[model samples]
Target: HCRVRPAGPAVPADCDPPRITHAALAARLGDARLLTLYDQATWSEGPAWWEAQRTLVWSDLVGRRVLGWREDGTVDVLLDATAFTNGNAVDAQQRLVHCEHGRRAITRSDADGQAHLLVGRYAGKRLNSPNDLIVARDGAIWFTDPPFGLRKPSQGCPADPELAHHSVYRLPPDGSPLQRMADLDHPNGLAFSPDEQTLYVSQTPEGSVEITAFAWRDGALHDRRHFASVPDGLPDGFCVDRGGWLWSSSGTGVCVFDSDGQLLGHIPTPGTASNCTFDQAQQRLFITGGPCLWMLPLP
Candidate 1:
């Protein structure tokens, strides 16, 4: 069911404290040679490293698909016609949770390939459009609802006027429907702090991007604040490294920012890098960009 192999030679490098630059816009840092690019197809994004499965998983927005890359460089499609799937994350049980844009709902794919609808509606109205999803250690599901995947008149209309506005939601571990978080103009990608005390949500803007931090208490988010802002290309999908640094995806490349919102370095990439996650024992970072997959060491 799973394949494993020895990673490339060990490259010992210092995890130097990143430099913070406050100019018109912070520049992307890091060495581009660290990234190992591959050939694939689709608008790739939403990369997640499944250590238990020894695999790297991600999504394709326009292709409506999910893919898995093995350690040996063998790649395969995990799901096709994915109902306009965008971002993805694994639950406490390690089950895959996906956000379907076309379906305006959240789904879980089991080991047998059976898809279970976890949340499809709230307050008697269909979700605006579940675009990205993340799960906490307590098994609660957090996701964003935006009408990004709907097709003009072809897609179903929003059931309520309030659904048109973008917001984040959480589904309790007990399988409850959903609870709404504060409304963001457009919530694209997100992640929880390593300690689980802070929940960071990526706000996608037409011009630039901002990452919002929320206080997690009583299983909910409170006291939101601006964590960081990408003044250049849009912030699409991102994850936090073991060092408490957030790796945010942007058109220029992947921007590594420290917990204090200080710009670290950039992982320059070819084409357009959408999102990324650390794999290979958290030492290597894998990226989903364009119709291809890429990897770079974290050090």
Candidate 2:
């Protein structure tokens, strides 16, 4: 339903991938369902759950704001000056972590609505654009550095010569971000495994639209494996559930996969899904799409 093409010319010419057909998913996924899909997001991305406040949150990048949906069908504007915040996740301390494309940095917001910078300048240069991010159980934060927002900084944030190139980096707890992984064409979405023993990375460049699995060891990375290819849609963002199932974003809806990399099911969404997260109840999946927020009953 959606096309994810390469972002650069470094990709080879022989990597012509196949398209996703209804039949391909027919046997693997259950009946597709759409709860509520919105159509008015200015590049909608990053859907997260606030376990403490019992709120579901998402962002409208071009809109430069963060939106929240409550359990009672009520929606509220959480933050308005996010400067094109993309990926979002809550740290072990339950603090809200945001990646800002406007300033090319990572920020943490307090309960009182105050903004604090965790890390921004790495290797003495600003990041290209903190596209998607995840918080590790180790109190460290990992995010993908790509040229997505920076490609058209005029759309929101202006371009900065301080940052160049792209890679996956880590922002140590109360410290600066250190480059962890390199050589990704356009790394987009990422998620840690249930036990945190493995890290899943998604790259959506020209010839490489695949997900790779990395082993977490000794405060670094080791052992590499390809997980899956981008199925009909660009991999944006995703989350892991209590059952160790990965609910990932695809072209038409949410792509569900087990720990063993088998397709479990697909949740057909009426709107373009951007990201997904487990709600405070941990029993429902909160999905952020075009202009709508959806919730699903999950065991």
Candidate 3:
């Protein structure tokens, strides 16, 4: 295992907060230290690594824009008037697929400055609010519909939720109807297993926060089970490593877990992180906290 702690001030006596659970977590964390790359955002979320651009892009919900951080340590505005987009993902075709909180829809773009609304309403009523999303291998789109966008203007211009319940949805690739996959209270971040057979979802209820697992089979999800619980911060956004370990954003820091849902470790950051994503090579993790972008090199 690798452990490379950056040279800095003494681990502040008051900063002696619990971080990791399992000793083996060291190998994955290495000697990593939280490196603040930028800190000019009001509230940042939705980190997406564009392989073709060789840079990292994320959403500034409060700014109503999307920004990118390049390898050369430069930041640029990627998109404006984003309708307070929340979550984002680069599809198999290298297009940007994102969830819009203000527009109450899921949109996609080919990086040509034009966005096509993919889905907006359900059952003749506006949706609750699309929060986070993921693009499947077959080009199918799955995302969580929560009311954060409608609950507060800071999140997205406040509006009334038309849907009766918050849940997860699947938009088929063949232009089929939008399908509701699972019923969840506050489903936030989600990811597919390395083999793409299992789907992990974060349920961020007010008091009870946990991760749920579903068996993906026959174009449908089944066998819902509690995968893990977030003991501290609310599990917002996360990514699965090649080793099948889940690196999730938490209230106190980033929590690491194994495939079996065992708490492995934690990587503390400066603020409560909203989301995280891995670089193309999966060598580093980019996290969006309150108003800053932090990076942690993996072993």
Candidate 4:
């Protein structure tokens, strides 16, 4: 179920990345090409770039581990038996926060590698399963919780869920009561605009997936409105670029959209993409798709 590459090499130029589906996408890509960094993962997702380490950390959900891709062209195991962690984010303090499915909690690993439990239960019941998350500039942690992990043993260890509805939650830096942010059919991926004024979330329902925009005001999210509808695949995880454009994972590859939810273009990949993030310099985009980790030079 995996294709292990003994040596890492950029994909040959002739094949080209996914074809640009829109005219605007061509301008944003420039001469950039997609490269395969690694190709042995099973269910790769949750790519988070660590500026201090200059590395990308992502989850191998079915493999039950956390892996890291360094700037020096090497991959390493960051954590083993990861409790089926699905999504990840770097906190304001530079800590690594993870959404653990098997453990059904959000855990943060400090710089020194100390693991601290952030939240596990809500309203006297265990959470459905923490999925994707993001750290706001204001030091608030927002994450999506759904029951996908508990529905089957392959995705995650099967367990009965205590909560009836899937929703999102937010935790303050001061350790206040965890606040339920929004309720969707199935909340998957989340991101913030460049100015951090609008929060976007992907809702993956049974038949379709759509990205919704929320107005951020006075530390709360308001005005949930339909942002955009993913045309091909579910929007699993994504990141916002410095210019306020959104690079999101889809069935075929990465999809780029403007802040107003207009589809700018698409980058085709060899497999379905689960998540993606930009490097610290924002010059490169790293994506987790199928069994391979893909990288593309940004505009």
Specify the highest-TM-score model's number: 4
* lDDT (CA) per prediction: 0.72, 0.70, 0.82, 0.83
Show the colliding residue pairs in model 4: 18-268
Q: Backbone clash tally for model 3?
A: 6
Candidate 3, residues 1-299, lDDT tens digits: the string is: 11112223322212223366587777666666677777778888999998988878788888887787777677777788689888988988888888999889899976575668999988878878888999988889999998888888887878777888888999988975889888888888999999989999988976358888999999689999988876677889988988899988988778888999988877777788888999988988898988887887667
Query: What lDDT is reached at residue 91 by model 4?
Result: 87
lDDT of 1 by residue, 111-201 (tens): 8755578888888877877877888777888998766655333233334434656789988898586888768877888888899888888
Residue 66's C-alpha lDDT in candidate 3?
A: 78
What are the RMSDs of all candidates, in order?
Answer: 5.5, 9.1, 5.5, 2.8
Better of 2 and 4 by lDDT: 4
Tens digit of per-residue lDDT, candidate 2, span 1-299 = 11111122221112112222445444433332334423345667788888777767678787777776666555566787677887777888888898888878788888876558777777777777787888887788889887777778633465654655577887777655475565477878888887888888888775577777888877777787887764668767788775666778877777877777877666766656778887765666677766556666533
Please list all clashing residue pairs in model 1, or write none if there are none: 29-265, 29-266, 30-266, 40-291
lDDT of 4 by residue, 1-299 (tens): 12223335466422346566566667767878888887778889999998878778888898887778876567787777678888988987778999999889899986555457888998878898999999888788899997899986967778888998888888888866789878887899999998988998998877347888999888678998998876688988898998898988888788888888888888877788899999888888898975778888767
Q: Give per-model TM-scores.
A: 0.83, 0.83, 0.91, 0.92
What's the ranking of the predictions by lDDT, best on top? 4, 3, 1, 2
